Amino acid sequence: TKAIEELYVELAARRSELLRKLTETFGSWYQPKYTPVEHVVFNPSSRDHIQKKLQEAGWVPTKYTDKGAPVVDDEVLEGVRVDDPEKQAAIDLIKEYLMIQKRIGQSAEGDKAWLRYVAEDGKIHGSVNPNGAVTGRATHAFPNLAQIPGVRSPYGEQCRAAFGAEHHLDGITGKPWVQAGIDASGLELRCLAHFMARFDNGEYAHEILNGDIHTKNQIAAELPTRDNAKTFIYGFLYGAGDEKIGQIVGAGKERGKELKKKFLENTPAIAALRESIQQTLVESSQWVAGEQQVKWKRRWIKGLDGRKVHVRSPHAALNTLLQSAGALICKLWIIKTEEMLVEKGLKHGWDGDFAYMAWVHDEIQVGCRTEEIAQVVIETAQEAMRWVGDHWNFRCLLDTEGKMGPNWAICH
């Protein structure tokens, strides 16, 4: 509680400086209400006043998403140039003000904020819906503990340092505890190698087991960061266009075409699997110039446990075939990783040996009393993942990776 009130009192005196310094630059004006006028001032939170002030500052947007208005986001406020050099520095302050405003709205002043869901024992109880998505993915609400900013975002480490497991002293010794976080690396990309192994005869999952896939994908695709490469591969895989994956690298549609032609001719089994799924599900698709009329044949897909997975759109069938089969192995793994610990002779709960804290879509966060218990957990997680990979007769080899720490800033 104290570490987040210190952050709130830190970044509340920042946006009160970014409004006194900014309204003297971008002055007020009259707006038409005998003609009724009003003296309205510059509101940086509204996306309409900034558009009007960038019209009269000598800037052409050259991008029109709406039929009459340009788009205003983070990627158009970086490549913007005006004649007055004060506004060029003021746009960065506007972006910082919007970031601090979102930080305030998420952290403390929100209706579903952090400080309004703290119990008397200094803990947060969040609603975790096990089946909320259409692909069997669990959701989180009241509050949402799976959408806080990461370590790459500004004011990211100072927020994840407060959501720690070392803030719970033991009731018999008065000692903090140890947090272990275990993440799977390359889940859906290995499940894709499991599905299309009957087309390319299974020589695709061997390169994935041979070192890291995202690192050599970054090397072969000359992306600057690993995160941009991981974004680009799942953008290209789940049915992109010609510009939305050229937007990841920032270039035009020619680079977006040549990267698709490059990554398509490497492994010619994605299009064959897509054609097999389209031959399985749909039979006819009439085309409309403003809509689409599709006569369905089988709306549902049999999953890994016979569950009828629903399909919303026919060109997103690979999406609902991949991520719906990827959540069930994690859902069985989180069961088996405590079914082994209970049969081993441990005790679950705050008065015992370990306690589950957070389960986002990929990684788990467990908190335990001693480091030997964390060693037992990080040893048995690989055995549980191997039993998951062996129980449904997978052609691939599943693997995870765990981290040990005091809080949830190192173990991200």
Binding site: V9, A12, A13, S16, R20, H39, V41, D48, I104, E109
Partner: protein
């Protein structure tokens, strides 16, 4: 509260419009929202506009959520604030302008607050004394935390805060921002914080607003009254360590009295007409123009001009009021102003012209003019004759306390019954102070003059210390010889 999304109609989007439990919809794309005087002033009649304050800085949304609107009636500008109830109706109004014309219309209750018509549940609350600081805290906190303000000021906090008890009882912690004291609230709950400026508006307009928000969430305890612990005396004693005024006329007095201090009561007594005024006048003349201290006299026996003539004739070692030719000669040759200027160029002397009206004049002389030694004479006119003199001595002891002034008081003696009189050389006792018996209880130094006008030496006097708290040395100090030609009595070396 948010429920789900509906397709909009204005912008025509699919997931732009959102539906709520209250029945209203809101689109994120098209930005369309659906669904005395004794007279309360109408909003639309008096040209009500929600204009944002420019000279101090308050957004429009805070004025909309608080009800602080500007009227343009009669060609002038009024700032009407509204006080409401728990039901959600306008109870009273307050009108403020450039001349601060306090025109409080409507039924203004004795427990009127501001900002209580929206807030019933919570943990913290901030109470201020004005309205601009309250709106400033709403600006800093974006109008989402419970902050109220008094509707009558910090002068009548014993009535407004006392009448509202169950409203403040619903919360956990009450934080005050009055002055940078009301104990009607329950103890163990109220915190008081201190700002480095005058109020919150100065910290807002001078960039110290962070020091507002650091004091809200980390306010300090109550600390009721002037019960001072021993830890808070580190620098006050060191300042107090960094002085006795020397008694001129005799060196035997300062060997056992060590002068006078700040807040020191000196009492001067003798028989009927044995020369108290001459001795105190000599001490005043030797302390004023020879030591650089500002001395205020309150001689009530004579007038201002007569004691001025005394002082002038004394300092020039003559007898002015004892010869008409000496008074006539000094004005015919122009030497009168030479005695005036060299004595009154520094203006260390301040005389008084003639019972609670005296204490205000002494406070105006001490605080305003900045004097150090105040002298009072002839206490008999000022003062049942037991309660009045005790109340007078108590008020003068309270005035001399915590000020740093040397208070000299001239008193009298009572009539004896048996034995010899005081004019023949009787040794005076401590219990001869007439009027009361508390005059020797609050005085810190008591000096008595003894002489025999009918004996062998009618110009030999004796000084007797009767009470001394500082050292504890009382008795005969010495002997002094009076001059019948100059007035200046000199220290002698007479032996018994």
């Amino acid at each position: 509260v948010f429920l789900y999304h509906i397709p909009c109609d204005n912008c025509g989007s699919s997931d732009g419009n959102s539906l709520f439990s209250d029945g209203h919809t809101f689109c994120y794309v098209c930005e369309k929202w659906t669904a005395m005087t004794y007279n309360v002033w109408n909003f639309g009649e008096s040209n009500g506009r929600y204009s944002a304050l420019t000279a101090r800085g308050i957004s429009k949304e805070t004025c909309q959520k608080a009800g602080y609107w500007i009227a343009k009636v009669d060609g002038v500008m009024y700032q009407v604030a509204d006080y409401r109830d728990q039901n959600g109706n306008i109870v009273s109004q307050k009108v403020r302008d450039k001349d601060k014309n306090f025109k409080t219309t409507g039924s203004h209750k004795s427990d009127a607050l501001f900002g209580k018509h929206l807030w019933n549940g919570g943990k913290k609350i901030v109470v201020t004394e004005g309205e601009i600081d309250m709106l400033t805290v709403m600006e800093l906190q974006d109008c989402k935390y419970p902050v109220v303000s008094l509707g009558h000021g910090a002068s009548a906090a014993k009535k407004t805060c006392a009448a509202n008890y169950e409203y403040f009882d619903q919360f956990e912690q009450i934080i005050l921002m009055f002055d940078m004291a009301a104990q009607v609230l329950p103890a163990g709950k109220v915190r008081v914080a201190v700002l480095p400026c005058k109020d919150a508006n100065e910290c807002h307009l001078n960039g110290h607003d962070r020091e507002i928000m650091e004091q809200v969430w980390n306010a300090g305890p109550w600390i009721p009254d002037g019960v001072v612990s021993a830890l808070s005396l580190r620098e006050r004693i060191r300042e107090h360590l960094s002085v006795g005024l020397l008694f001129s006329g005799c060196t035997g007095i300062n060997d056992k009295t060590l002068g006078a201090r700040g807040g020191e009561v000196i009492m001067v007594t003798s028989g009927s007409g044995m020369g108290k005024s001459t001795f105190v006048r000599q001490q005043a003349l030797q302390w004023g123009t020879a030591m650089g201290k500002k001395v205020g006299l309150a001689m009530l026996q004579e007038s201002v001009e007569e004691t001025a003539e005394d002082l002038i004739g004394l300092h020039n070692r003559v007898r002015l009021r004892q010869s008409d030719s000496l008074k006539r000669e000094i004005i015919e040759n122009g030497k009168f102003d030479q005695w005036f200027d060299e004595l009154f160029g520094n203006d260390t002397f301040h005389l008084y012209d003639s019972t609670d009206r005296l204490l205000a004049k002494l406070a105006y002389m001490r605080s305003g003019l900045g004097c150090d030694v105040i002298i009072l004479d002839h206490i008999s006119i000022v003062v049942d004759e037991r309660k009045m003199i005790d109340n007078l001595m108590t008020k003068l002891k309270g005035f001399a306390k915590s000020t740093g002034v040397v208070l000299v008081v001239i008193c009298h003696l009572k009539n004896p019954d048996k034995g010899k009189a005081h004019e023949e050389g009787r040794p005076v006792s401590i219990t001869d102070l007439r009027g009361s018996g508390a005059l020797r209880q609050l005085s810190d130094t008591i000096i008595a003059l003894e002489r025999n006008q009918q004996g062998d030496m009618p110009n030999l006097v004796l000084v007797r210390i009767l009470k001394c708290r500082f050292t504890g040395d009382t008795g005969i100090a010495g002997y002094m010889e009076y001059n019948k030609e100059t007035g200046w009595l000199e220290p002698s070396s007479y032996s018994g």
